[PDB]
């Protein structure tokens, strides 16, 4: 399976600088185009930057020329974003994606999920963790399929980004459904994992991972003894 | 100067309606087009390329036209796997821009409010925490009048055991309560019932500790 996964994202103070990764894997990395895609909290897509295969060409979204700077190695199947002279409003998740074909004119089929960049001076409240699951009903059955909710709550209202992790690997993105809601002073977001009844009855341990604004907050769960 | 604009902002439709967006090129980017669906929290997923072109796997009540500077996207059928933002982009050459974005929304039909109960869970280790929660999620009704009782083996719970609150979201309300039991309480093996009274018709929603 084609698999990228970003990682480097953090929290950075404006006019400073932060390199991002994103690992490539599951195709013939050296074949293709490369791009990275940003989001900034609540916004749209942004285009960032591409690169070609063999480094030969290379452009920049305006917002970011002259101060971020594309590169790959194929040898290592990479892509890296080296990201200077920070503002505030390059506070964003940070994607990177795969070309469909070999041409840098083909839609991006393949994205990873991101990794987040804050940059700011402000401090901020973190947030509260908390995993829920499913209970069982009058007969002490099992529902047909086990929920796990991941509780994220209490923070200042900014970006979070939840990761579930099944005995330390990060779980399939569509095993899980994601929605938030801000009170206006806060935002709380829950994530729900759909498991199956043998894949909860093998003790695998599964971990809610949260970064925000630098920090990696987590609870985990196993089935009860 | 390059732009790519979308309409409209947002859009609500009944299930089965059809939908359709628009995205706008400011300069003639032929058929290298692109349409993305985006839900929250997750990275977009490719729909349509080449401006018509379905990507493996999208169902067949998507479509997509345009060349040139004027596209549109179209659900014939809207479903609530649609419930999205939808984003187009162009690949002519760079930039490789993203339009503004379009949410699709499902116009809501009165329908009762689901309930269901969550409980805590334990610890990496298989431990029970010190004490257990039962919480109570009453989600998607029309903001009104709600009371929600907990009933133990059928019998009214100590009113103090148990919180309750409300965040309205958009014009949905939703609720929930928070019962909380000694872990020695939990031990005991009872059937907790959360019932739930609203527009003056009950639901509940029962359970226990797996065995």
């Known amino acids: 399976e084609v698999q990228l996964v970003e990682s480097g994202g953090g929290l950075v103070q404006p006019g400073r600088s932060l390199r991002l990764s994103c690992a490539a894997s599951?195709?013939?990395?050296?074949?293709?185009?490369m791009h990275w895609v940003r989001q900034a909290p609540g916004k749209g897509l942004e285009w960032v930057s591409a690169?070609?295969?063999?480094?030969?060409?290379?452009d920049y979204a305006d917002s970011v020329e002259g101060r971020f700077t594309i590169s790959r190695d194929n040898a290592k199947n990479s892509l890296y974003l080296q990201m200077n002279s920070l503002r505030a409003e390059d506070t964003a998740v940070y994607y990177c994606?795969?070309?469909?074909?070999?041409?840098?004119?083909?839609?991006?089929?393949?994205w990873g999920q991101g990794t987040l960049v804050t940059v700011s001076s402000a401090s901020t409240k973190g947030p509260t963790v908390k995993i829920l699951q499913s209970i069982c009903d009058g007969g002490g059955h099992f529902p047909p399929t086990i929920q796990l909710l991941c509780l994220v709550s209490g923070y200042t209202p900014g970006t979070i980004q939840i990761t579930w992790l099944e005995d330390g690997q990060v779980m399939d993105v569509d095993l899980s459904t994601a929605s938030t809601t801000q009170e206006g002073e806060l935002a709380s977001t829950q994530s729900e994992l759909t498991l199956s009844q043998k894949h909860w009855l093998s003790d695998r341990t599964y971990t809610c991972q949260v970064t925000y604004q630098g920090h990696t907050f987590e609870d985990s769960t196993k089935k009860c003894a | 100067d390059i732009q790519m604009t979308q309409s409209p902002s947002s859009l609500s439709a009944s299930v089965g309606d059809r939908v359709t967006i628009t995205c706008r090129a400011s300069?003639?980017?032929?058929?290298?087009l692109a349409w993305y669906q985006q839900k929250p929290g997750k990275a977009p997923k490719l729909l349509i390329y080449?401006?018509?072109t379905l990507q493996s796997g999208v169902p067949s009540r998507f479509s997509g036209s345009g060349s040139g500077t004027d596209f549109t996207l179209t659900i014939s059928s809207l479903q609530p796997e649609d419930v999205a933002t939808y984003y187009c982009?162009?690949?002519?050459?760079?930039?490789?821009?993203f339009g503004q974005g379009t949410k699709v929304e499902i116009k809501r039909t009165v329908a009762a409010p689901t309930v269901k109960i969550l409980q805590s869970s334990c610890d990496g280790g298989g431990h029970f925490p010190p004490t257990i929660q039962l919480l109570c999620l009453v989600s998607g009704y029309t903001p009104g009048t709600i009371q929600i009782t907990w009933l133990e083996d059928g019998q009214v719970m100590d009113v103090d055991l148990s919180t309750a609150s409300t965040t309205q979201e958009g014009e949905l309300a939703s609720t929930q309560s928070e019962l909380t039991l000694s872990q020695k309480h939990w031990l005991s093996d009872r059937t907790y019932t959360c019932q739930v009274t609203y527009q003056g018709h009950t639901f509940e929603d029962s359970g226990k500790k797996c065995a």
């Open positions: 982009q162009r690949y002519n050459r760079a930039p490789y821009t």
């Open positions: 690169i070609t295969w063999n480094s030969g060409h290379i």
């Open positions: 994606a795969k070309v469909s074909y070999l041409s840098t004119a083909s839609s991006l089929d393949y």
């Open positions: 080449a401006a018509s």
């Open positions: 300069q003639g980017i032929r058929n290298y």
């Open positions: 599951g195709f013939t990395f050296d074949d293709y185009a």
